[PDB]
Fold this protein.
Amino acid sequence: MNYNNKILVSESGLSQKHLIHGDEELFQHELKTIFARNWLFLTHDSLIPAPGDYVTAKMGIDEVIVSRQNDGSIRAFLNVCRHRGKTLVSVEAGNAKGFVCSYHGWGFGSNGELQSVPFEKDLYGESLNKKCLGLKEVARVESFHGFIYGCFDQEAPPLMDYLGDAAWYLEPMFKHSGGLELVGPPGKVVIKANWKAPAENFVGDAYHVGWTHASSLRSGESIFSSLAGNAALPPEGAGLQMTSKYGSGMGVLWDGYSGVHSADLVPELMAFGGAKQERLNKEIGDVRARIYRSHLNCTVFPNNSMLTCSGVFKVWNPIDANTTEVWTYAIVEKDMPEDLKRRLADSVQRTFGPAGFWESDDNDNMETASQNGKKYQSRDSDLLSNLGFGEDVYGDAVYPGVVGKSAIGETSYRGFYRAYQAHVSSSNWAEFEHASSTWHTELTKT
Amino acid sequence: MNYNNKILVSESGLSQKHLIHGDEELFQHELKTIFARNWLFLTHDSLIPAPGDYVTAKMGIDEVIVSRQNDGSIRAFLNVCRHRGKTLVSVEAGNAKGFVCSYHGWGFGSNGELQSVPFEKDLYGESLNKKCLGLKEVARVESFHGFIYGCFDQEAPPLMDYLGDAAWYLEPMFKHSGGLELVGPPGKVVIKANWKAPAENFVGDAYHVGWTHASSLRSGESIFSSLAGNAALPPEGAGLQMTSKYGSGMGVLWDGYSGVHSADLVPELMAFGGAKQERLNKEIGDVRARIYRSHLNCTVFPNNSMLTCSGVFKVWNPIDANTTEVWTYAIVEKDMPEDLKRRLADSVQRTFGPAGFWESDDNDNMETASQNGKKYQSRDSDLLSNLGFGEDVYGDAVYPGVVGKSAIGETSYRGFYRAYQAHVSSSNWAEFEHASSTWHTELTKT
Amino acid sequence: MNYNNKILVSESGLSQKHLIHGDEELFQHELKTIFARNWLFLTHDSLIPAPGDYVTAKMGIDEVIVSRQNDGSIRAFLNVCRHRGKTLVSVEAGNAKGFVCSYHGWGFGSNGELQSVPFEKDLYGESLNKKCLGLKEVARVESFHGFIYGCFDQEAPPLMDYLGDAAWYLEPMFKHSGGLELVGPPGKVVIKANWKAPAENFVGDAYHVGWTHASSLRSGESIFSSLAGNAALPPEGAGLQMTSKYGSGMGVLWDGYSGVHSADLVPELMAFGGAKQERLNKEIGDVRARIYRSHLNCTVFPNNSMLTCSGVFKVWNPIDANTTEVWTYAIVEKDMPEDLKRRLADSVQRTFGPAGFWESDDNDNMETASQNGKKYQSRDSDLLSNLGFGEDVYGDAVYPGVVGKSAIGETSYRGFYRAYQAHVSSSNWAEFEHASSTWHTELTKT
Amino acid sequence: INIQEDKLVSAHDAEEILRFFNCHDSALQQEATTLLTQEAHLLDIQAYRAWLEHCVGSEVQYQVISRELRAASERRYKLNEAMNVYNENFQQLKVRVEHQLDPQNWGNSPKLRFTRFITNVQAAMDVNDKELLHIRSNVILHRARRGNQVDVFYAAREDKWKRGEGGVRKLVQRFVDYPERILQTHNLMVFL
Amino acid sequence: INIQEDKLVSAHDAEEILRFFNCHDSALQQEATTLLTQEAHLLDIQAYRAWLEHCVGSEVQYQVISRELRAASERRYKLNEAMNVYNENFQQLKVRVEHQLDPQNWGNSPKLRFTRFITNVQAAMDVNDKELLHIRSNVILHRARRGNQVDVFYAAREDKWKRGEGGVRKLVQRFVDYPERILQTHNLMVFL
Amino acid sequence: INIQEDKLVSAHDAEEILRFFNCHDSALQQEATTLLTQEAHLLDIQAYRAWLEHCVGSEVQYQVISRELRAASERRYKLNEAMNVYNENFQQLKVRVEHQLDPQNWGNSPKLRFTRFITNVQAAMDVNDKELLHIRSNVILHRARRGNQVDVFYAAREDKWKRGEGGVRKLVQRFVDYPERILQTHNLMVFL
Ligand SMILES: CCc1ccccc1
Ligand SMILES: CCc1ccccc1
Ligand SMILES: CCc1ccccc1
Ligand code: FES
Ligand code: FES
Ligand code: FES
Ligand SMILES: [Fe+3]
Ligand SMILES: [Fe+3]
Ligand SMILES: [Fe+3]
């Protein structure tokens, strides 16, 4: 397939070829043009707070070691020995000043340097150039309010610019709330879906909630529960959708601070969020303080998603075109009482974890939609994302980005897939920029 | 591999490259040139008799919904939602006026039309063109005496012409018997064989019976039992072989009406078939009435096989070059007493079903023959089908098609693979026809 | 990938691209340029001593039948029926005058000839040319002191020349000891590693022993046990490394006759080897008699490895780039007392068999090193084998081949991968020779 | 069980539960365990004639079904719900046993390896026929052959056993509703 | 067990061993086997309401954890070692049961098939609470759905059971430390 | 069993059947179940020293074989039929235990997870040695490690157990003929 010419996503992101969910050659091409190029979620400060603390993380199909340095910074390295390529670290988290390879015993520092080689003097003499044998380092590692992302491409925009117009929406909860903590360890489950299936669902799919999650809405007694079985449409002004230049996007459901949490947490949460909102009015204004306590379903392009307020935090780790390893963490606000944090974390896993009853509702939808992308008669068929097209705006006086001023639509699918196609057809960041110089105009046509 | 030029099947169908059973690129090419082009078995009238009745079926690797319309016709559609490609129907059979997608709730009619979209007015307004969003329809659906076949290619010959000279042999049992019923549900088992391995075996392999099925012949006490361990050759005139332009073919074993059925059904069956034969003499003539009560091992190209009288009905559903999902139904004559039909159905499954002891005899033969097609030293080796070559006739005064007037030979392999090669090397039906204008001459050479 | 031009192994064998352990296209190319071209281990005289005795063996991904002929010679044939390609022999060893196919009953002799065809006269008449339908024969089968190797390529060097300078090292144990026997049946286990990972480890990896096998060294109380956890370096003169033109190589650890065997066998073995060494001094000289009772870790290119004295004998049978089927036999000296042979065989399996506790130490090392070769950021990375480079010699007055006069180094990796690259980039043996005309000069540079 | 409230429960399954919750007899559960363990042993070592002679009643119905996947809400489509993978009387089991023992059953060389795991044994005498023993048990059946072929079967078995020749309890009915619709085990050629 | 000598043994595991090696009561082991077999039967037939009513105590904690992989020598990193796949009180189990029974749970059509194998049953009364029964058992849980989806779960269960309404022994705590870190079963939406 | 009639049955297997069909002692079957369940518990928690101390006799032979695939009709080829995956005396088991416990056994970090399922227990005293207990049982052994590595072993075990120190019954012989010829579990580094 010629990725320079092949129209995988139509103009304005209105449709995508179904093969994108099934084609293994395209998956291999995404490793290069999506995963090796873009910002990928690694960890949070709260999981590696002290010098020597480390975790392992996936970046695409690669595995990295992410380590807190003595100077307080974080560096990340390929989990691969520079000698004969054995996996260095076999655990998920810990604290160490270095990592020793179990094959021939080479010792690397937490800073990635090759520090020791068994019997170096007797064997290599002075001929081994250890300075050139440090672990392969992730070129870019940056933080968004404690959330640590990595990028293999030195040419990428800074993480903040990469978030584009999505940053404005995330800031009230990520920054102005006093800060979030990631509660680990994550749940980890393999699903037989393409990573784009859950990524697109979290970025902009409010339409599915009433129908897909009918049973969870009815059974769990949560705040969005009036929607079970499409019994009721969210009223006008119930929310909005947004998307951005580099692909990130989200839905906003006004005031839904208790999110998917069952009735057992609703009063406590609605009290807590409301109290902080009243304080934030004076600091960031009424609109932004309201966004703080509003439910955001967001994907940070390409494969990191979240539900704020619900506190669900997801990584869709790619394995192959029909296989994804799902990592699920909980996010909590630092200044919540510890007992509330504990119950919120359990509730995140109860609803969206390995045995998350809400998440289970999505299984067949994402797996079959992905697997159908391999089927002969469906490869060249068009997946539709045209809902709300012709009603999006850009440059609004209050809400930034390409914005659909309605709770339910496909605005964020369009921006997600516009960025995806621009990356797939580009050889580097400069080409992506050239392919994106009229990004918002393309999204707001008609 | 260049399929225009590559000789996968030699002149007159005398041999085939072993790689045809193992090569995944060729398997992908078959999805296009075999499965998307030819007639494939779907269901029987008896399984969807009433308006709203439906089943799911495979057509190649694609899945379709096959539905009885209000007007008594049958239409078939891809089991894929026109929105974001989720699998619409998750069951195997039922009755419904439509199908609702579990993702965003789009509702399609039994006629494939997009009938409803949740909150269409509020969300899409008048902008959603539902008339253009009907399920992807199977272009051609036709019946052969209640047996329903589908074809994705609008350019295909009518099913009756496609059956070619094989139709004459099938008619006494399929038509003149008063009609057959398919007894479901089918058994379903995955085997690690290429679909062509059982297809070629059913189309023309009488040679294997005495040796492969020695234990089943000896243990089951059936009518063809004198052959166990090659203890005895069928006498001269015991039967014949035939093949046809579009690939279908069969063996005929004279008078073997009780087929593979154990001695517990032999007297009843031989009485029933003989009685109907005596009636049919006056209607269709002695020869054709004899064919009615003669055992036919047939493949309807490409991947539907049957043993008449034994009542075995097979679909070899392709998964990959070494994986096939075997569907096994029973066929019964409508005017058989109900108790006989029930016992015949059980006996079909007893012998050739998921725990069919006869079918188990074939397992290693078909699996290893297929898997060896992947092995380096065997890929370019030649599978032989030359038995009886130079003794076939065409245009016989009594028996139509390319015919070998002997019970055991490889006549039907040759016609099967001649059609296969003509399809693989052709881009469309017109090219197949051009490649087949001297089909019978090629088969009867020397 | 263009294998003519692609530098997979750098000059002097100093590094290899990590992708060589993971790339499936390269694996397919190796079937042609490595496995179909080179000498592969089949069996030993001791396993098929009598006329009619046979075993099955893998040669690359192909399976062969290896049969003792009436005249005392050995011939090998593809385990594939010449009719429709079914696997002929389903057992691992036995005695027979021929092999009958379970599909249509064709009978082949132990000499590969098609001897019988059921009902040949009635079916084929005189038209079947059985003389042209013998099993596909392995072109070359030769013996090295009872050890039987095969080669599909008629153009290969004789086995003895192919062993090159490695033969001199093997002869004291293989020839001058009075002869070895292979004790079967082998253990058989699948590991998720590329075949080159254990092949390179056995050919030249003494460096890993103290660290990888720390627990086995400490627990088993063997003779090389001072090395556990890199507690001690082997003294100067403790051994050497060698490699050869056609890729075979080995490490030599002086005097280590009891090898990996636990203390329960050490006194008996050290007595036995010492006694035979004293006899051999007079016959082959002191140096070569010492080599007899010295521990050799050797790979016979490409995928047959052994530890002499320990008595471990390995075939790394390739399945795909990350899958290898490991066959483990024991070697014993013919003139050992039978009770010692029995205990030695059990000890080989105890340490290096399916539940070999030493072998288990290597699992993660070889599996992850291989699997990392598929990971995006590692494919183009360089595996290092530069230890000892610039200190190797060729043409030594005492020790032949390219030789590193030190116990621990990567000399044998370099010769192994030099031969590998020359084969991968060549279309035939003549081209390999042309690519190897300065093989030792390349290895001894700087 | 009220199946109007427990909406996922079938009438058949609710009936079978009821027979075991009533009179629990510990001695009977133990006898049943012995009976099934010995039966599994005979099958595992491929003593199929001994199995017939010692474990199988002359009036046996040995039945394994495969049920077509239907909508949970389905109420109109009323055609054959299941097919019989097995539905054997004694003579039909004997045919299958002879097929296993035939020296020209090529698939049985080299010899197959069977290992059965029998768990969850429950036993209850029939209410109306005090000589009819109901036994429920689950089986994991592992079949290995030809180096690297491994097939694992999983099933619940509803049995009836009755005293026959010499007072030996023998199988008079086995019913299995096989839980996997599409078999991924090459075939179901094993005695569950 | 001396865990200073048996270096791979956790303090928790050594404590649990101790409770079963002491007073062995054969009758108690048998009662426990019956209790767990009947519980598994109710779950297998998807009688989730009956399971709650007959098997689950009002004060239940139903907990399945997933433990982060840490170095065997790790002694400094002290952040949350595990997450809760399940950590349910009675009302939370009821929510999950209602979710299973809801007619708009699309994933449950066509009907799922469950088969449970319960083995290695051990039972011991608590030392301090003579009405608290400790029961240990292992489960293989086979779930089949949608033609060719097959998921097999494996776990050890540490239970506490106590006599409740009508004197019926009910589950007051189940603890499972799930042995596979990354699930290869699509989800853990089964009651272990 | 007449092995001339039951042609698939080996002389060895027919002999083993005979020892269990004779004197059935229910109490002995129960003792055996307890013994094997406690042994499996110690192994599952990786208390390998406790296993040696409490479960393994000083005169033990611990043997697991792999049998070469031969023709069912084979009668001439008479070379070694099997190899020993294990064939250990007490000191050799101790070596393996020390290897497991060694802090430089890198493969054991992060810690492995074992779950054993023991079924089909049969027990019979020896005819000639009234202190020798024959115990037969089947095991499913699940080993999980490193996030997504899962290996499942299946086997029948022929044991002899005898009263040793303090009157504690200990394993004096275990024999397993492993049913899979080519292992698909990376290794057989587990105590069956
Ligand atoms: C409210 C839960 C949700 C999840 C994904 C997308 C939108 C909404
Ligand atoms: C008579 C059974 C049979 C089956 C296939 C082919 C030919 C014949
Ligand atoms: C001494 C064991 C060994 C094994 C492989 C390589 C070198 C050495
Ligand atoms: S591979 Fe890491 S030290 Fe050699
Ligand atoms: S995918 Fe079917 S309604 Fe959206
Ligand atoms: S395939 Fe061997 S005889 Fe036909
Ligand atoms: Fe959802
Ligand atoms: Fe057949
Ligand atoms: Fe090693």
